[PDB]
Amino acid sequence: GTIARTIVLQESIGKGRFGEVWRGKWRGEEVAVKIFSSREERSWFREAEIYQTVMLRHENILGFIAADNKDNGTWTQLWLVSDYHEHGSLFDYLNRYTVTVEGMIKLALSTASGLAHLHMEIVGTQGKPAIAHRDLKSKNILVKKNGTCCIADLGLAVRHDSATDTIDIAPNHRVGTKRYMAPEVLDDSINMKHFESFKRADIYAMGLVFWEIARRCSIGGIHEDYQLPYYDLVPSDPSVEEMRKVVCEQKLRPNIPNRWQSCEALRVMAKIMRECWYANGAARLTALRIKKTLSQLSQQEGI
Ligand SMILES: Nc1ncnc2[nH]ccc(=O)c12
């Protein structure tokens, strides 16, 4: 293609389960290129399909540029070109840095604004269907130069046809990162024909993400070391069983240190986390309500 032939790959920045991410230069600008092999076409095509959803572009959704293919003379590579964010993942950003209260609210609100857009159905001729991430985690959220997030890795997404209340790919199996799986996903009680269930499962995962950010918030040089949710209860790369035992049976969640009650911003973040973590998906906050809360918190702080 015309786009892939003009892109120079400079650095392989990640090797995931579906495709490898490269830092490339396009028309003198930095771009991220997700490359898939010939045998990963279904993964590539689906992610292109999601990223090309009508009215998807949003400041807190990774900016998609193009799908393309590149023949190097021996084999074809399937490309997905998108915006490049030098900070990379929220995961890397939180491992590397601590944030201020202003910084924390910025990352949390942008994530919630991006998820609220994804979840929001826009009716019209240029209508946008409601979309559920299904694999929301700190490794799938990128951090922009201005200190705000954007949701990335939309390849596992599902889209809602609101008129019939049917999901475009009618999921029949559990997907996503085990650590971040909602209680109803771990114990397989989730109604996979119920789109609102998927949005609720995303909210649970966002609550875990907020916890990771809040730990790295530095007030009076006090903060926790970076940790994945449940680091204190499950091993690295946990199994569904290891997760179900903790999240569903023992019904534990990431610990909220009492000192988060000391700060107004961490109090708001802690109440949100708790209202994301309810074992019953229906009691959980909606992403739009979280966006409303944090927007109301940000304006006061003066961001
Ligand atoms: N688009 C991006 N920009 C910068 N870093 C990234 N790392 C991993 C996956 C991405 O998509 C990405």
Which helix (H) or strand (E) element contains residue 297? helix 287-301
d(CA 132, CA 209): 16
SS3 of 210, please? helix
The verdict on whether residue 16 carries a ligand-binding annotation is: yes
The CA-CA-CA angle for residues 201, 104, 195, to 5°, reads: 15
Please identify, by atom number, the ligand 1 atom nearest to the C-alpha of residue 84.
Answer: 3
| 129-to-25, 167, 202 alpha-carbon distances in Å | 32, 10, 16
Cα of 250 from ligand 1 centre, angstroms: 36
d(CA 133, CA 140): 10
d(CA 145, CA 260): 27
| 54-to-2, 85, 126, 159, 169 alpha-carbon distances in Å | 23, 23, 6, 12, 17
d(CA 191, CA 284): 16
SS3 of 20, please? strand
| Amino acid, single-letter form, for residue 170 | A
The verdict on whether residue 272 carries a ligand-binding annotation is: no
Asked if 223 and 101 count as a contact pair (C-beta separation under 8 A), the reply is no
d(CA 31, CA 3): 11
The verdict on whether residue 200 carries a ligand-binding annotation is: no
| Amino acid, single-letter form, for residue 18 | F
Asked if 216 and 191 count as a contact pair (C-beta separation under 8 A), the reply is no
d(CA 145, CA 266): 24
Please identify, by atom number, the ligand 1 atom nearest to the C-alpha of residue 14.
Answer: 8
**Four-way CATH pick for 87-303: 1.20.950.20, 3.40.50.300, 1.10.510.10, 3.60.21.10:** 1.10.510.10
The CA-CA-CA angle for residues 250, 286, 57, to 5°, reads: 125
d(CA 158, CA 53): 11
Backbone φ and ψ of 296, nearest 5°: -65, -30
Output the DSSP codes for 109-132. Answer: HHHHHHHHHHH--B-STT-B--EE
Place of tokens 């973590």: 277
SS3 of 232, please? coil
Nearest in space to 241 (alpha carbons), one of 190, 201, 200, 181: 181
Which helix (H) or strand (E) element contains residue 264? helix 264-276
Residues enclosing ligand 1, CB less than 6 A?
Answer: 13-14, 21, 32, 62, 82-85, 88, 142, 152
The CA-CA-CA angle for residues 293, 137, 67, to 5°, reads: 110
| 95-to-92, 139, 215, 236 alpha-carbon distances in Å | 5, 11, 11, 16
The CA-CA-CA angle for residues 58, 118, 208, to 5°, reads: 110
Asked if 110 and 60 count as a contact pair (C-beta separation under 8 A), the reply is yes
- The residue ranges of every structural domain in the chain are 1-86, 87-303
Resolution (A): 1.7
Contacts of 94 (CB under 8 A, 6+ apart): 138, 212, 213, 215, 216, 226
Q: Could you tell me the end-to-end alpha-carbon distance of the chain, in angstroms, rounded to an integer?
A: 42
Residue 132's beta-bridge partner residues? 158
Which of 13, 15, 43, 139 is the pocket-test mutation for ligand 1 (most atoms within 8 Å of CB)? Answer: 13
Catalytic residue ranges: 135
Which protein residue has the closest C-alpha to ligand 1 atom 2?
84
Asked if 107 and 148 count as a contact pair (C-beta separation under 8 A), the reply is yes
Asked if 33 and 22 count as a contact pair (C-beta separation under 8 A), the reply is yes
Cα of 126 from ligand 1 centre, angstroms: 28
Place of tokens 């393309």: 68
Tokens of 14: 């990640």
d(CA 90, CA 238): 20
Topology of the domain covering 1-86? Phosphorylase Kinase; domain 1 (3.30.200)
Residue 30's beta-bridge partner residues? 25
The verdict on whether residue 209 carries a ligand-binding annotation is: no
Tokens of 240: 């569904």
